[PDB]
């Protein structure tokens, strides 16, 4: 029961529970990515740190959604967390491509829930996503795109390596 | 006259004036609640403080709306402030039930004005309410619901009292 | 591949991966317990905090095991995380009984892996568990047993309540 | 003579003296590695520092074992220290491969002495090795494996170099 629920549709409540699952699955995927890069035969500790930090950010996003579900009077429901899609993640370029696909999927789930909230005339839900999630995703996807371009630059060629070093070491 | 008004409907202007009245009436109701709990034959000073703080928060909400009305070029109009609905407020449980009814009514008035602003394509009004009022109301109603559950727990039974004390004194 | 693996059996490697699953499932169970107690119709915020802290401790235990798996040259493998066994957790007493069952199961899994490590003459694994997990579990189970006794004391009777308050408020 | 010896086998005493020899031989090997990298025709001062630090760590391990031998009432006996196996150590990759072989040999000698101590029911010896040597060796061998992977990455190819620089300079 709840004595607080007001203007909070059953459709939003259930979509919030699905989005918590998506963010906890993404956290799990980033935990697997992180520990893969800590393998002695892979040994890229900054790439491990990058993904382990993202694991923490996705768990915190799930926790914020769960706090909001209770603030609105909905009821958290948990489902199983699917294991990540790979057991080994390839090169840094493979891993960063998998990470941008994952973030694009989270961003589309946020936009779909925003559209539901707008259809349901739920401005608290719409502002919650705008304030705490939509720009976080735009900023992260921009960073990951910049990283993809620099990984390819570096692995690709002499001119690319040189251009990267000039930026990093002179400018 | 105004030389600043732009995209601000007469419908929103008048609804903002009505909402100022509602928030100043709510402030008045909480002033009455506060002083009732300060009576020597009632004597629950933390309950008096809880409501007197809410009186101040509702007056500040009215003042923010009035500042916004002038920022947009509308004209504040004041109406009489109806006296509160009761002269004596019963138990803490009665008073907290009356407070959650009052907040639900303020929250629905905010949602109604947001819907008007959206219909009028007034995004400054819609963001103003989202930023300064809708989450304040969700947070307060969640707190008041938590309080209702704990008041009933405590007044209700042995097991309830014990469970409350374990949470408060051990955890 | 690994060029570091030494004295680390495939049996231990696989049992470490199963134990990571058990600790991440326990973290998930405590996340569900935590948010249940944050419901407005339950509203025991110290009980929510108690379980949310335990969610964090169990995730950190899984992360320590995963770091160890890579330190030894084994390979992390993740499986799906089963959803928790309940969607609603009852009273504080129900929840604390479920938590002690969960910890007893983690403790027996630690003792089983210690016995495997001893059988495999793997003293690094055995000391790792002794140093970082076995006394943490004994201490937590002792605390949870103390809590069960005090919850029952408090919910049970006049004499019990009084005895608890004397300890908390005079001594 | 000793008036303190208790539960300390002649087999452990003699194996501790052999292990002191092994650790002082390893210190000697790392002193030779260090000064080879300080040659003007080799000139890799960070590699010289890496090995000179390991020379100091292995001498300190021998000193800890000798303190323990006297704490237990055994008698230190020293043997000649064989010169290191090479006079010149090749590339950084050659040297790091020689260092991981050396550490694996020290780790197996520790595991063999732990097994002797366990067979002799000498828990003080077994805990001494667990506490002060077995995890130090696991951690060092993990670091050396990470280093081998990064040396090969860097010397091997364009893509490898680029991937290393992205990790070091962007992440």
Residue numbers in the entry:
A (entry chain A), B (entry chain A), C (entry chain A), D (entry chain A): 1 to 171
Provide the authors' own sentences about this structure as they appear in the paper.
Ferritin is a self-assembly protein cage consisting of 24 subunits with an 8 nm interior cavity. The 4-fold channel is composed of four E-helices forming a parallel four-helix bundle with C4 symmetry. Herein, we have engineered and constructed a gold clustering site at the 4-fold symmetric axis channel of the apo-ferritin cage. Using a series of X-ray crystal structures, we evaluated the stepwise accumulation process of Au ions into the cage and the formation of a multinuclear Au cluster in our designed cavity.
Thus, in our design, four L169Cs were expected as the main fixing residues and four R168Hs as auxiliary coordinating residues, which yielded the mutant design of apo-R168H/L169C-rHLFr. The apo-R168H/L169C-rHLFr mutant was expressed in E.coli and purified following the same procedure in our previous report. The resolution of apo-R168H/L169C-rHLFr is 1.5 Å. The binding positions of Au ions were assigned by anomalous electron-density maps at 4σ and distinguished from Cd by comparison with the control apo-R168H/L169C-rHLFr structure and anomalous scattering at multiple wavelengths of 1.15 Å and 1.00 Å.
